[PDB]
Amino acid sequence: RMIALDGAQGEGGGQILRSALSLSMITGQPFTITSIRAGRAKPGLLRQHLTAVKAATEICGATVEGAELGSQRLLFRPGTVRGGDYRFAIGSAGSCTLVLQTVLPALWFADGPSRVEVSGGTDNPSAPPADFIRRVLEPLLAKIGIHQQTTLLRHGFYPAGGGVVATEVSPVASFNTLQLGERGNIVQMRGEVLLAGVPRHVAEREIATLAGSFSLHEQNIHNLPRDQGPGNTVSLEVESENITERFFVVGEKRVSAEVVAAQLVKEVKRYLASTAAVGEYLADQLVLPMALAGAGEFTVAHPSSNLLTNIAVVERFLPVRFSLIETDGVTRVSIE
Ligand SMILES: Nc1ncnc2c1ncn2[C@@H]1O[C@H](COP(=O)(O)O)[C@@H](O)[C@H]1O
């Protein structure tokens, strides 16, 4: 009944926490995580973690133990998942899209449609960008039979807060089996820069660097209100026959525009150097919805630590088994 999870190996406050919350809500199985971030200088639950826990609590009327800052043990007993309108505030301490990742899978199982609006940080280097959710994950979720639509309403560039991201979701009626493999041909490359409170030549230089390495069929520069920054991100959308993927980098303080763009070029080339449609990050975000569908597969060039973490937690809550068969430097991930 009570699922016991160990945070000692990493992600106790992160991916394990987020996936455990939603799976717990979905299945009705309570869980306890112990040793949350025990080996970190500031150990246990951090502010952003409690926000995620409190959000899940509100959605399903949960009882919780140990939901305090610095706690290395968390116990969560879910109640019934209610649809409806939710507003969460994670502030600069966290990522809007990570709260969304935490709560949305549960809402696929609510009794009615929901809307979730989260205030806090956007454009975080360690979270799915709102546009990634919208343009990469959501078209695939739709294929799986999950219908949700995310819109960023306001930026609050990391490490600030003040951004706003909202998702509309409806309960799943029926799941489908999504099967992905080879990427197929390029249809177009789309380069993008966002700026807030940063000189416009910075975007021009970033686009120029991208163009240096790729033929860009589309190019976009968006200058946002200064108060939403300072901030700068560069993205590249790879639209292929079989999938659309997206890669982004967050501009750093003392890093030249050219270097920032160079980091993104390297990332995209690494993706293109393999045959797989699904990229490194998307892989970890497909595991949960495919496990819930009971079936599905994709290939990925490099199974990440996060992908494996997610697989393990999912298998703890659901009687599914992932196969990961690697040949020729590409791993086929299949929900048995
Ligand atoms: N550049 C990115 N694009 C899309 N998703 C990302 C990116 N970086 C991180 N994520 C996702 O955000 C979550 C947390 O990432 P991490 O903390 O790096 O494990 C995971 O679901 C990642 O796949």
From Swiss-Prot:
<dbReference type="InterPro" id="IPR000228">
    <property type="entry name" value="RNA3'_term_phos_cyc"/>
</dbReference>
<keyword id="KW-0963">Cytoplasm</keyword>
<comment type="similarity">
    <text>Belongs to the RNA 3'-terminal cyclase family. Type 1 subfamily.</text>
</comment>
<dbReference type="GO" id="GO:0006396">
    <property type="term" value="P:RNA processing"/>
</dbReference>
<feature type="binding site">
    <location>
        <position position="281"/>
    </location>
    <ligand>
        <name>ATP</name>
    </ligand>
</feature>
<keyword id="KW-0067">ATP-binding</keyword>
<dbReference type="InterPro" id="IPR023797">
    <property type="entry name" value="RNA3'_phos_cyclase_dom"/>
</dbReference>
<dbReference type="Pfam" id="PF05189">
    <property type="entry name" value="RTC_insert"/>
</dbReference>
<feature type="binding site">
    <location>
        <position position="101"/>
    </location>
    <ligand>
        <name>ATP</name>
    </ligand>
</feature>
<dbReference type="GO" id="GO:0005524">
    <property type="term" value="F:ATP binding"/>
</dbReference>
<dbReference type="GO" id="GO:0003963">
    <property type="term" value="F:RNA-3'-phosphate cyclase activity"/>
</dbReference>
<keyword id="KW-0436">Ligase</keyword>
<dbReference type="InterPro" id="IPR036553">
    <property type="entry name" value="RPTC_insert"/>
</dbReference>
<dbReference type="GO" id="GO:0005737">
    <property type="term" value="C:cytoplasm"/>
</dbReference>
<feature type="binding site">
    <location>
        <position position="284"/>
    </location>
    <ligand>
        <name>ATP</name>
    </ligand>
</feature>
<feature type="binding site">
    <location>
        <position position="306"/>
    </location>
    <ligand>
        <name>ATP</name>
    </ligand>
</feature>
<dbReference type="Pfam" id="PF01137">
    <property type="entry name" value="RTC"/>
</dbReference>
<dbReference type="InterPro" id="IPR017770">
    <property type="entry name" value="RNA3'_term_phos_cyc_type_1"/>
</dbReference>
<feature type="active site" description="Tele-AMP-histidine intermediate">
    <location>
        <position position="306"/>
    </location>
</feature>
<dbReference type="InterPro" id="IPR013791">
    <property type="entry name" value="RNA3'-term_phos_cycl_insert"/>
</dbReference>
<dbReference type="InterPro" id="IPR037136">
    <property type="entry name" value="RNA3'_phos_cyclase_dom_sf"/>
</dbReference>
<protein>
    <recommendedName>
        <fullName>RNA 3'-terminal phosphate cyclase</fullName>
        <ecNumber>6.5.1.4</ecNumber>
    </recommendedName>
</protein>
<comment type="function">
    <text>Catalyzes the conversion of 3'-phosphate to a 2',3'-cyclic phosphodiester at the end of RNA. The mechanism of action of the enzyme occurs in 3 steps: (A) adenylation of the enzyme by ATP; (B) transfer of adenylate to an RNA-N3'P to produce RNA-N3'PP5'A; (C) and attack of the adjacent 2'-hydroxyl on the 3'-phosphorus in the diester linkage to produce the cyclic end product. Likely functions in some aspects of cellular RNA processing.</text>
</comment>
<feature type="binding site">
    <location>
        <position position="285"/>
    </location>
    <ligand>
        <name>ATP</name>
    </ligand>
</feature>
<feature type="binding site">
    <location>
        <position position="128"/>
    </location>
    <ligand>
        <name>ATP</name>
    </ligand>
</feature>
<dbReference type="InterPro" id="IPR020719">
    <property type="entry name" value="RNA3'_term_phos_cycl-like_CS"/>
</dbReference>
<keyword id="KW-0547">Nucleotide-binding</keyword>
<dbReference type="InterPro" id="IPR013792">
    <property type="entry name" value="RNA3'P_cycl/enolpyr_Trfase_a/b"/>
</dbReference>
